[PDB]
Every structure is written in structure tokens, then in C-alpha cells.
Amino acid sequence: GTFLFTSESVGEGHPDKICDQISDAVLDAHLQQDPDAKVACETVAKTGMILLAGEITSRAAVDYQKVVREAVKHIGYDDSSKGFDYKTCNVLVALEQQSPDIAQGVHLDRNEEDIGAGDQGLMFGYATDETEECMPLTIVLAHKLNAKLAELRRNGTLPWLRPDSKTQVTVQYMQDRGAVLPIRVHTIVISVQHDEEVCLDEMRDALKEKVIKAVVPAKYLDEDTIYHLQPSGRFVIGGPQGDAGLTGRKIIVDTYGGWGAHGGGAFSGKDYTKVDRSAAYAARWVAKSLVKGGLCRRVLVQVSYAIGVSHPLSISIFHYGTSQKSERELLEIVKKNFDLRPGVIVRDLDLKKPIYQRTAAYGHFGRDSFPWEVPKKLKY
Amino acid sequence: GTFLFTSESVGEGHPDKICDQISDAVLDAHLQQDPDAKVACETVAKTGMILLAGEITSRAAVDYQKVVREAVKHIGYDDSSKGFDYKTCNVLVALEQQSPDIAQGVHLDRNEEDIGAGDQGLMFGYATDETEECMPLTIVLAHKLNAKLAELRRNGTLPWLRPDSKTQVTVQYMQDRGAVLPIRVHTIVISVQHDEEVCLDEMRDALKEKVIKAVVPAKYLDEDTIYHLQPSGRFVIGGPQGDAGLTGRKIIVDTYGGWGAHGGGAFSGKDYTKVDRSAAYAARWVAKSLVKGGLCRRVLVQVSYAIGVSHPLSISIFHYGTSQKSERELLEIVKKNFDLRPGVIVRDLDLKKPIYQRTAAYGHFGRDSFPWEVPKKLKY
Ligand SMILES: C[S@@+](CC[C@H](N)C(=O)[O-])C[C@H]1O[C@@H](n2cnc3c(N)ncnc32)[C@H](O)[C@@H]1O
Ligand SMILES: C[S@@+](CC[C@H](N)C(=O)[O-])C[C@H]1O[C@@H](n2cnc3c(N)ncnc32)[C@H](O)[C@@H]1O
Ligand SMILES: COc1ccc(-c2nccc3[nH]nc(C4CC4)c23)cc1
Ligand SMILES: COc1ccc(-c2nccc3[nH]nc(C4CC4)c23)cc1
Known part of the structure; x- marks a missing residue:
């Protein structure tokens, strides 16, 4: 009945994550002046x-x-010794207006509630009762390890740390009537960019004592847990110098760490009419509402859209065997309680608010009581 | 017992897919001279x-x-009237050497079989017996609709077609002891870039008669099937002019259309040491071997790696209830039959061969008898 599952996370200075944060800093700058x-x-x-x-x-x-430059400064790339500097890097802009053909088919001369989806696509929402925040333990731990590295870098505890990092956590789970129960941590990987002076032994000791022990409960760690700390042996070159970054290249880190399912759409740099983001946030909201509402212990929701059409083309719910209600019954409850048109999701989730840069590192879900994390009280 | 599932695909001229094809054209150009x-x-x-x-x-x-320019010419963007022209576009190059810190930790002074994974990460393989090629019907149909558009564009049957397209297929399935059985097509979306002269009615009629009817068996289409053909109403601006494209932004289209699972890594533009591609191809090979070998009807495989370490950190198998063997038994069969070190996968799957541009449109799986699609005969 036991199995292993692995998820990863990345830090704020991972090059792909830098791009997601800059794209959302640009989105927030626009929304501050034009909702x-x-x-x-x-x-x-x-x-x-x-x-x-x-x-x-x-x-x-x-x-x-x-x-x-302000977004890069926040991340921590402020000197050529770190491989990147907000003060002196090149910023190139190739931005044009939205295609008038898209605008006419999606939102021009349309009542806001009846705006079309900004593109076709499929999106999933997922929730699991294995943690209070309804997220998989593998991805929660992986994110917290990166957040701890940034905290110790910023407070000067480990001054050799640099902003680029990656973590990976493998947990051994027990199957429990469709739900999953974490038992122990099987393997942890941590790779983090560092200065030229610190030695490998000093880094490995600090990553175990000050990072892992400060994040992972001791009850999950035992004599068999495998640790791969700085497994490459050297990570001085990092950030964009070590690897090109692009927006929307960490979509599994942004969501459920491989659990549930993903429709392929990236979140960062997109306003609410782009259902890749708004409908995935709404699907998470529905899934978390079904779990917090006591209808299921674990659930997956799929929705899909066509460009220019407001109502979803399809809606599906899978409860993994953790509900006494059928999919038909759960779909009826969702129909009575939610309206998944983008022009209604924007109102329910307050999606014109410039809070997007806050979502762009450490996952979009399971944190900070964003509107899609506050369950809706269901009537049925 | 019935449910809906939706998948999408995109054409060769979709801007993200243009990037995947160019990245793989660059990879193949290098491998032709330096394996x-x-x-x-x-x-x-x-x-x-x-x-x-x-x-x-x-x-x-x-x-x-x-x-x-040759890759863009192949796609069909050869005139400013189409929005992009290989002859006259700007090609900018910002390519540097691989980080020496990565090189020393992964492959320098290592025996080929014992090369480390080029990065950490998680990867999944999936196979389903619902089609002969062991792929979900939703994604197979979505890809074939885009391929049919390109065929009719290239043969001059529908000269108003342009290279940028997207499709989406929703199928109603029946659950069958863990396996899935397609029943009917619930909804089809097709959006394709077109010339200024053709009218909407002419396009919608052609998309139904010459595209859908030429691809989707009539037994799956009925009076209730919903069609969203050119739902935006106008798609003259397209390709990179209509939407920025990036490599690795269609990872769900490249794989299983939302079925199975995805670890987040992109495939295009990467050599075999990048396990995001080689280990996902090997995991598909294992999954398809388990299904063609008669051990399961449907299966998901997860593997994970740490940078610099050759052997996977974890391996997991989920058979959805479609095997008489336990996960422990299937894992033992996989251990006896496969070696998932990147330096062994390269030999088994011939991953130094410059065939990558052929994988970069219409999915990496379920086509053309590539090495990862030829099942291994299992000994047990
Ligand atoms: C290993 S690099 C990807 C492969 C790379 N594009 C190459 O040229 O081989 C991917 C991510 O790993 C991390 N990374 C970069 N250099 C590394 C090193 N020396 N050791 C460990 N991880 C590293 C960074 O977070 C980077 O974005
Ligand atoms: C709708 S665009 C994405 C949204 C866009 N970035 C925007 O500015 O709103 C995404 C994909 O849809 C397709 N597309 C572009 N223009 C379209 C149109 N007028 N009608 C339908 N699909 C279109 C292309 O394949 C494009 O890459
Ligand atoms: C996409 O979300 C999932 C999540 C979990 C499982 C699963 N449940 C029970 C036993 C299992 N063993 N291995 C696996 C997975 C890792 C291959 C597995 C399957 C799919
Ligand atoms: C990631 O791969 C999957 C694939 C299929 C199912 C599934 N199986 C049975 C009944 C169902 N109803 N809805 C769903 C899904 C669409 C939400 C579903 C679940 C997960």
C-alpha cells in the first residue's frame, strides 16, 4: 500500500522564476493604473x-x-560578483498592442460578465486533505526549503548563499481509501548558488543543520533518509548566467508538484481574461471548497474553454474514491455554487487587484489566504 | 460511470511550437557534427x-x-502577408558555453554509462490501451486535426489557411476496471489563421467537411456534438505577430494532453544528458512496454534524479487497478529489465541521433516508431 512520490521547487533567483516574477511585476504595474x-x-x-x-x-x-530593475533588486541580484546586477543589466523591450483580432473576438463590445475566454485551453484544480492548506506535503516541503534558504541569505546567517536554488523532496506515502497519508521523507535534494570562498563540507553541514532541520519535522526524517546536498559539487555560476530563464517554465512548481493534473498554461504575466490563470485559480478554489466542505478528502477538477466563449465547454470532477457522492452529484453542487465564466471569476476572486507578483514564487496555491484559498460555503 | 476529458493540440506555426522546432533544429545541427x-x-x-x-x-x-531560417521556411512563414517571413526576419543569437560548474559536476572525467543527470527533476511516462499507439484518444484526435490543416494548406486544397492553429477535443469516456473507453466526441474547437479574403461561413463549412470529417470517425460524432469553429470570428493576425512564442510552453501538448502526469520539464533544444527529455522518453518506453507486454491496461511511471547522480532517486508505478501484479512486483520487473541511468538510456534509445526536429510538433509520443515507442520484450 506504500509508494514514493517526488516534487521539486525553485528559489526566487532561479532564472525561470526571475522571469515569472518580472512578468507579474509588469502586470501589477499596469493594473495599479488600469484595472x-x-x-x-x-x-x-x-x-x-x-x-x-x-x-x-x-x-x-x-x-x-x-x-x-526593482524586481531584480528584490530577488537579490545586485552585484557582478553574484553573476547579475539590477543596476547594470540590459533591459530590452519588444512589447506591442494586443492583436485587434483577439480583442474583437474576446472582449470588445461585450458586457463584462459575458466576456469570452481569452484563449481555448484546459485547466485543473486539485486539493488534498493531507495538510491543513490542502496541498501535497512533497511540494509544501520543497517550497519551504527554498524559502528558508532565502531567509538565511537575507538575514546574513549564511552570507555565502546566492539567490538561485532548487530543492526536491521524495515522500513515502500510504494509500488510505483514495486519500494519501505521508509517512516519511525518503530523499531530499538541495542545490544552491554560492560564493567562491565557502567549502563544500561547510555548505553540506549548514544545509542539513540550518535548512533541513529548521523546515522538515524530525518525525519524517530517519536513518534511512537520503540527502543529496550540493550534489554537483560546485555552483558558483548561477542565475541567468548559468541557465537561460523564460516565463512559464515552472508550471508544475507553480501548482501541485506533479500531483493532480495540469493543462499546460502558464500563469505569470497574464490578466484575468487569460483563463490559463483565472480558471486554474477558480478550479483550485472549487477543489479546496469541496475538501474543506467535507465532501471529499482529495479531488481533481477539470474545466476547458474556447476563445471568445464565456461558459466552460466541459467540467469534470474526480474524487479518487474519497466521497460518498457521485461525480454527477458533485457536478450539480458545483453548478449551483460556482459560475466559471471569466467575467464572473474576476469578481469572485478580485482578479483586477495588483497582487500577482506575490504569487510568482513558492507556488500560487496553499499560501497567504488569497481569494482562491478561502473556501466557499456550499449550499446543497 | 461516464465522464468528460478534454485535451488540446497546436499546429506547426503556433508561436510556441515554432520555438520548439527551431530549438530542435539547432540541436540536430549540432548532433550532425558532434554527437x-x-x-x-x-x-x-x-x-x-x-x-x-x-x-x-x-x-x-x-x-x-x-x-x-530553414526551420521557419519548412513551417510555411515565407511572406510578410502571412505575418512572418524566414527570408527577412531578424535572427539574434545570445548563446554561451555550458557553465563549467555544471560540466564538472555532470560529465567531465566520467565514464559515459556513469554520467550524472544533467539536472535534478521528476518525470513521468504514461500509456493507455485505448488506442493501438497507447495514447489517449483526446490528444491523438487533437494532433490529427492540426496535421490535417497543415496537409490541406500544403496541398493547396484550402489556400486561405495559414500555419498557426489550435484544436481541442472533449471525449466522453466510460470507466472500465481502471481502464478508459472512449464513447463519443462531445466538443471540438478549431482556430486557424487565415487570409483576409475568405469569409467565416466558408471557413466553418470547410473545417467541418474537409477537416473534422476527414479525421474523426463518424461513429464518434452525433447530433449532440458541439462545434466551435473559428470561435473568435477573425484570425488574420497570427504566428509570432499575434502572440509571443517560447520554447517549452506546450509541454502538455508534447506529452499526454493532461492524462497521466507531468514533472514540468520541457523537451526541445536539449541533449540526452538533460533528463527532462531522456528520462521522460525512457519512462514512456517503460509504460508502453508494460501495456504492450500485457501486464497492465493503463500505467503511470514516475522517476526522479539529482544533478550529478546517475541512478534515479526514486521510481514509482501506478497501474490504476488494471494489473493483477502489485506496484512492488511491477517495480521488480522494471528493475530487472531497464537501466534508467542517462548514460544507459542514451544507448538504448539512440539519443545522439539527430532526429529531434521530427519530435517537436504533433507530440513526442505515439508516432513514427521512434525507439521509445518500440516496446521492450520483458523477462519475468
Ligand atoms: C543545471 S541548469 C540546466 C542545464 C543547463 N541549461 C546546461 O547548460 O546544462 C538548471 C538549473 O539548475 C541550477 N544550476 C545551475 N548551475 C548549477 C550547478 N553548477 N549545480 C547545481 N545546479 C545548478 C539552476 O537553478 C539552473 O537554473
Ligand atoms: C489567443 S493568443 C494568447 C493571448 C494573447 N497573448 C493576447 O495578447 O491576448 C494564443 C494562441 O491563440 C491563437 N490565436 C491568436 N490570435 C487568435 C485569434 N484572433 N483567434 C483565435 N486564436 C488566435 C494563436 O495560436 C496564439 O498563439
Ligand atoms: C498524478 O497524481 C498521482 C498521484 C499519485 C499516484 C499514485 N497513487 C497511488 C500509488 C502510486 N504509486 N505510484 C504513483 C505515482 C507516482 C507514480 C501512485 C498517481 C497519480
Ligand atoms: C490526470 O489523469 C486523470 C485522468 C482521468 C481521470 C478521471 N477518471 C475517472 C473519472 C473522471 N472524471 N473526471 C476526471 C478528470 C477530468 C477530471 C476523471 C482523472 C485523472
Whole structure:
């Protein structure tokens, strides 16, 4: 009845995550001035370069140089010794207006509640009762290990740390009537960029004592747990210098760490009309509402859309055998309690608010009581 | 017992898919001259621009201008009237050597069979007996609809078609002892870029008669099937002009259309040492071998790695209740029959061969008898 499952997370300075945070800093800058901004901002990062590419139609006047550099400063890349510096990097902009053909088919001359989906696509929401926040333990622990590295870097405890990091956690689970129960941590990987002076033994000792022990409960760690700490042996070159980053290349880290399912759409740099983000947030909200409402212990929700059409084309629910209700019954409850048109999701989840940069590291789900994390009281 | 499931696909001229094909054209160009090239080529596409960003260490002498332009010509973007032209677009190159810190930790001074994984990560393989090629019907049909559009564009049957397209198929399934049985097609979406002269009614009639009827068996289509054909109403602006493209933004289209699971890693532009691609191909090979071998009807395989370590950190198998063997028994069969070190997968799957551009549109799986699609005869 036991099995292993692995998930990973990355830090704020991982190059792909830098791009997600910059794309959402650009989105938030537009929404601060124009709540109805149409934004599709992709970011690319390589040695010394941030490139913004995409489509924005907005009444805002945004200083992209300032917005980009402030996001990079927050992450911690502030000196050429670290491989990247917000003060002196190149910021290139290739942003055009939203295609008028998309605009006419999606939102022009449409009542807000009846706006079409901004694209076709499929999206999933997932929730599990294995943690209070209704997220898989593998991904929660992986995110917390990266957050702990950033905390110790920022407080000067481990001054050799740099912003680029990756973690990976394998947990041994027990199957429990469709639900899953974590038993123990089988393997942990941590790789983090570091300065030239610190030795490997000092880093491995600190990663075990100050990072892992400060995050993972001792009850999950035993004599058999395997640790791969700085497994490459050297990670001085990092950030965009070590690996090109792009927006929307960490979509599994952003969601459920491999659990549930994913429809392929990226979240960062997109306004509410792009259902890749708004409908995935709404599907998480539905899934978490079904679990917190006591209808299931674990659930997956799929929705899909066509560009220009407001109502979802399909809606499906899988409860893994953890509900006494059938899928037909759960779908009826969802129909009576939720309206998954993008023009209604925007109102329910307050999706014109400029809080998106806060979602772009450490996962979009299971944190900070964002609107999609506050369960809806269900009537049935 | 019935449920709906939706998957999507995109055409060769969808901007993200253009990037995947260019990244793999670059990889193949290097492998033609240097089978041991270390390649991590990301591509970005926006109006008039192809940018290559990433890391390559290779003995090859590659003309990036020629390679990029030839890939764009093949796709069909050959005139400014179509929104993009291989002859006159900008090709920008920001490629550096592979980080020496990665090289020393992964492959320098290592026996080939004992090379480390090129990164950490998790990967999944999936197979289902619902089609002969062991793929979900939703994604197979979605890919075939895009392939049919390209065929009719290239043969001059529908000369108003342009290369950028997206499709989406929703199928109603029956649950069958853990396996799934397709019953009927519930909804089809097709959006395709077109010339200025053709009217909406002519396009909708052609998409139903010449595309859908030529691909989807009539037994799956009935009076209740919903069709969303050119649902935006106008799609003249397309390709990179309509939407920025990036490599590795169609990872669900590249794999199982939402079925199974995904670990987050992109495939295109990466050599075999990047386990995001090689271990996902090996996991598909294992899953398809278990189904064709008669051990299960449907199966999911997870593997994970740490950078610099050759053997997977974890291996898991889920048979959805479709096998008489336990996960422990299936794992033992996999251990006796497969070696999932990257330096052994390269030999089994011939991963230094320059066939990667062929994988970069219409899915990496279920087509053309690539090595990961030829089942291994299992001994047990
Ligand atoms: C290993 S790199 C990806 C492969 C790379 N594109 C190449 O050229 O081989 C992927 C991520 O791993 C991390 N990384 C970079 N250099 C590393 C090193 N020396 N050791 C461990 N992890 C590293 C960074 O987070 C980076 O974004
Ligand atoms: C709708 S666009 C994505 C949203 C876009 N970035 C924006 O600015 O709103 C995504 C994909 O849809 C397709 N597309 C582009 N223009 C379209 C149109 N007018 N009608 C339908 N699909 C379109 C292309 O395949 C494109 O890559
Ligand atoms: C996409 O979400 C999932 C999550 C969990 C399982 C699963 N449940 C029970 C026993 C199992 N053994 N191995 C696995 C998975 C790792 C291959 C597995 C399956 C799918
Ligand atoms: C990730 O792969 C899957 C695939 C299929 C199912 C599933 N099986 C039986 C009944 C169901 N109803 N809805 C669903 C899914 C669409 C939400 C579903 C679950 C997960």
C-alpha cells in the first residue's frame, strides 16, 4: 500500500522564476493604473539581459526599466560578483498592442460578465486533505526549503548563499481509501548558488543543520533518509548566467508538484481574461471548497474553454474514491455554487487587484489566504 | 460511470511550437557534427524576431542564421502577408558555453554509462490501451486535426489557411476496471489563421467537411456534438505577430494532453544528458512496454534524479487497478529489465541521433516508431 512520490521547487533567483516574477511585476504595474489592462508579458533572462516580449493594451504609463530593475533588486541580484546586477543589466523591450483580432473576438463590445475566454485551453484544480492548506506535503516541503534558504541569505546567517536554488523532496506515502497519508521523507535534494570562498563540507553541514532541520519535522526524517546536498559539487555560476530563464517554465512548481493534473498554461504575466490563470485559480478554489466542505478528502477538477466563449465547454470532477457522492452529484453542487465564466471569476476572486507578483514564487496555491484559498460555503 | 476529458493540440506555426522546432533544429545541427554536443537552446519568437538564448558546448560549426531560417521556411512563414517571413526576419543569437560548474559536476572525467543527470527533476511516462499507439484518444484526435490543416494548406486544397492553429477535443469516456473507453466526441474547437479574403461561413463549412470529417470517425460524432469553429470570428493576425512564442510552453501538448502526469520539464533544444527529455522518453518506453507486454491496461511511471547522480532517486508505478501484479512486483520487473541511468538510456534509445526536429510538433509520443515507442520484450 506504500509508494514514493517526488516534487521539486525553485528559489526566487532561479532564472525561470526571475522571469515569472518580472512578468507579474509588469502586470501589477499596469493594473495599479488600469484595472482593465490586457497583459500578456513574457520575460526572457540570460547573462546580463532581461527581455520583455508580448502584448499589452493598457491606459497605464509604465516605466519598464524601473519595474524590471526593482524586481531584480528584490530577488537579490545586485552585484557582478553574484553573476547579475539590477543596476547594470540590459533591459530590452519588444512589447506591442494586443492583436485587434483577439480583442474583437474576446472582449470588445461585450458586457463584462459575458466576456469570452481569452484563449481555448484546459485547466485543473486539485486539493488534498493531507495538510491543513490542502496541498501535497512533497511540494509544501520543497517550497519551504527554498524559502528558508532565502531567509538565511537575507538575514546574513549564511552570507555565502546566492539567490538561485532548487530543492526536491521524495515522500513515502500510504494509500488510505483514495486519500494519501505521508509517512516519511525518503530523499531530499538541495542545490544552491554560492560564493567562491565557502567549502563544500561547510555548505553540506549548514544545509542539513540550518535548512533541513529548521523546515522538515524530525518525525519524517530517519536513518534511512537520503540527502543529496550540493550534489554537483560546485555552483558558483548561477542565475541567468548559468541557465537561460523564460516565463512559464515552472508550471508544475507553480501548482501541485506533479500531483493532480495540469493543462499546460502558464500563469505569470497574464490578466484575468487569460483563463490559463483565472480558471486554474477558480478550479483550485472549487477543489479546496469541496475538501474543506467535507465532501471529499482529495479531488481533481477539470474545466476547458474556447476563445471568445464565456461558459466552460466541459467540467469534470474526480474524487479518487474519497466521497460518498457521485461525480454527477458533485457536478450539480458545483453548478449551483460556482459560475466559471471569466467575467464572473474576476469578481469572485478580485482578479483586477495588483497582487500577482506575490504569487510568482513558492507556488500560487496553499499560501497567504488569497481569494482562491478561502473556501466557499456550499449550499446543497 | 461516464465522464468528460478534454485535451488540446497546436499546429506547426503556433508561436510556441515554432520555438520548439527551431530549438530542435539547432540541436540536430549540432548532433550532425558532434554527437556529444551539450545543448540547451531556448528560442523566443515575436514579430519579426527569432532569438536563440542558452548554452551550447560543441565541436560543431553551426550557421544559426541558415538553420533558423530553414526551420521557419519548412513551417510555411515565407511572406510578410502571412505575418512572418524566414527570408527577412531578424535572427539574434545570445548563446554561451555550458557553465563549467555544471560540466564538472555532470560529465567531465566520467565514464559515459556513469554520467550524472544533467539536472535534478521528476518525470513521468504514461500509456493507455485505448488506442493501438497507447495514447489517449483526446490528444491523438487533437494532433490529427492540426496535421490535417497543415496537409490541406500544403496541398493547396484550402489556400486561405495559414500555419498557426489550435484544436481541442472533449471525449466522453466510460470507466472500465481502471481502464478508459472512449464513447463519443462531445466538443471540438478549431482556430486557424487565415487570409483576409475568405469569409467565416466558408471557413466553418470547410473545417467541418474537409477537416473534422476527414479525421474523426463518424461513429464518434452525433447530433449532440458541439462545434466551435473559428470561435473568435477573425484570425488574420497570427504566428509570432499575434502572440509571443517560447520554447517549452506546450509541454502538455508534447506529452499526454493532461492524462497521466507531468514533472514540468520541457523537451526541445536539449541533449540526452538533460533528463527532462531522456528520462521522460525512457519512462514512456517503460509504460508502453508494460501495456504492450500485457501486464497492465493503463500505467503511470514516475522517476526522479539529482544533478550529478546517475541512478534515479526514486521510481514509482501506478497501474490504476488494471494489473493483477502489485506496484512492488511491477517495480521488480522494471528493475530487472531497464537501466534508467542517462548514460544507459542514451544507448538504448539512440539519443545522439539527430532526429529531434521530427519530435517537436504533433507530440513526442505515439508516432513514427521512434525507439521509445518500440516496446521492450520483458523477462519475468
Ligand atoms: C543545471 S541548469 C540546466 C542545464 C543547463 N541549461 C546546461 O547548460 O546544462 C538548471 C538549473 O539548475 C541550477 N544550476 C545551475 N548551475 C548549477 C550547478 N553548477 N549545480 C547545481 N545546479 C545548478 C539552476 O537553478 C539552473 O537554473
Ligand atoms: C489567443 S493568443 C494568447 C493571448 C494573447 N497573448 C493576447 O495578447 O491576448 C494564443 C494562441 O491563440 C491563437 N490565436 C491568436 N490570435 C487568435 C485569434 N484572433 N483567434 C483565435 N486564436 C488566435 C494563436 O495560436 C496564439 O498563439
Ligand atoms: C498524478 O497524481 C498521482 C498521484 C499519485 C499516484 C499514485 N497513487 C497511488 C500509488 C502510486 N504509486 N505510484 C504513483 C505515482 C507516482 C507514480 C501512485 C498517481 C497519480
Ligand atoms: C490526470 O489523469 C486523470 C485522468 C482521468 C481521470 C478521471 N477518471 C475517472 C473519472 C473522471 N472524471 N473526471 C476526471 C478528470 C477530468 C477530471 C476523471 C482523472 C485523472
